[PDB]
Structures are given as structure tokens and as C-alpha cells.
């Protein structure tokens, strides 16, 4: 389960009802989808990000 390979790959879809059936009966609790949902839900609320790009 949860590892860097899912969180570090964070960097859209409207989460329709027909989605959550997808990749369900596979056998793994994919934290990557949960993290993407978390990001998408909380993004509903740029200059600093541009500053981060320039400073880097």
C-alpha cells in the first residue's frame, strides 16, 4: 500500500457516478486514486507557484 510512487506522482475529471466501479475488483486499495480525489476536491476553493518555478 501507500508509498512514494503514488504521492510523488500527483503532479480534470468531474468524478461521475460511473467512475468508482473502475479498478475496484482488482485486489488492491489504490491510494493513488484516493489522493487524486483528495486533491481534486480540495482544489475547489498561481503567483506563488510561478515564484516557486522562478526561484528553483
Of 27, 35, 39, 49, which Cα lies nearest the Cα of 3?
Answer: 35
Which CB atom, from 21 or from 47, has the smaller least distance to DNA?
21
Which span (19-27, 37-45, 48-56) binds DNA, by CB under 7 A?
Answer: 19-27
CB of 3 to DNA, least distance (A): 12
Considering only 2, 15, 23, 38, the residue that binds DNA (CB under 7 A) is: 23
> Where on the chain is the footprint of DNA (CB under 7 A)?
22-23, 25-26, 30, 32
Amino acid at each position: 500500500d501507500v508509498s512514494t510512487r503514488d504521492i510523488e506522482n500527483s503532479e480534470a475529471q468531474i468524478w461521475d457516478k460511473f467512475k468508482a466501479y473502475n479498478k475496484s475488483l482488482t485486489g488492491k486499495a489504490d491510494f493513488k486514486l484516493f489522493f487524486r480525489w483528495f486533491k481534486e476536491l480540495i482544489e475547489i476553493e498561481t503567483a506563488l507557484r510561478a515564484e516557486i518555478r522562478a526561484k528553483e
